[PDB]
């Protein structure tokens, strides 16, 4: 159905004002209520999640060489030679 209307006697609007900003309303809410809807600033936030085969952050140094050399022959030392890049985005 292109549309669908609901009706009742009371209504509880629980959507964020940022979303309510796009709803057509009538009659107009109280002047201040409108301003609050036009002006309430919604902050932005982003989460990035990465998956790991193991819980390396728990590792000790032994755990590292241990756990690491297990995946492949002399893999531990391979990274010791490599070291850490000196370029940061900081």
């Amino acid at each position: 159905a292109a549309t669908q209307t609901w009706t009742g006697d009371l209504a509880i609007v629980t959507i964020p004002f940022s979303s309510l900003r796009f709803v057509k309303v009538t009659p107009p809410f109280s002047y201040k209520k409108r301003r609050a809807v036009i002006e309430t600033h919604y902050d932005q936030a982003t989460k990035v999640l990465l998956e790991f085969s193991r819980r390396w952050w728990e590792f000790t140094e032994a755990d590292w060489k241990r756990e690491l050399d297990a995946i492949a022959p002399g893999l531990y030392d391979y990274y010791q030679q490599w070291g850490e890049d000196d370029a940061e985005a900081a």
Binding site: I12, V13, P16, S19, D43, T46, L49, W56, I71, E84
Partner: protein, 151 residues
């Protein structure tokens, strides 16, 4: 070569774009791995990753992660990641309401006020923004008013 982190739970802080990284408080039982909140940031810090689309983000995220824990971690990276941008969500249209100076005294009392038969609730109607407690707190309050409301 970055020292072994050897940390359980918690998270670390950095000025690289990842900003804050959190480690799982408990490991999923029966698993050998885990997922880490590689990058989590608000406002402008967040505005950044908002420039990139879902899929691209994982790259940097891993690099900035290595800058603090070592390039070594890359071995355990499964190559699987998930990203949630709240400004890009057409249902949240943002993380949460967060007032700029003066806004609260300018119109917060009007925020709570019902409009005719219309009542308002949710995180932003409270004063515990970016919290569930605010949400719930105002949900109840809403049900109390409509419940005993003259039909």
């Amino acid at each position: 070569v970055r020292p072994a982190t050897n940390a359980y739970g918690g998270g670390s802080t950095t000025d690289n774009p990842n900003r804050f990284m959190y480690y799982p408080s408990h490991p999923v039982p029966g698993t050998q791995g885990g997922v880490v909140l590689a990058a989590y940031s608000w406002s402008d810090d967040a505005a950044r990753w908002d420039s990139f689309d879902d899929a691209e983000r994982y790259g940097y995220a891993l690099e900035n992660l290595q800058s603090v824990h070592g390039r070594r971690i890359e071995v355990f990276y499964t190559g699987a990641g998930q990203t949630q941008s709240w400004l890009r969500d057409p249902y949240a249209c943002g993380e949460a309401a967060v007032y700029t100076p003066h806004q609260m005294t300018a119109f917060h009392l009007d925020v709570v006020r019902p409009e005719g038969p219309v009542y308002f609730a949710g995180e932003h109607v409270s004063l515990k923004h970016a919290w569930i407690e605010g949400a719930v707190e105002t949900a109840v309050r809403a049900a109390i008013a409509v419940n005993e409301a003259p039909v």
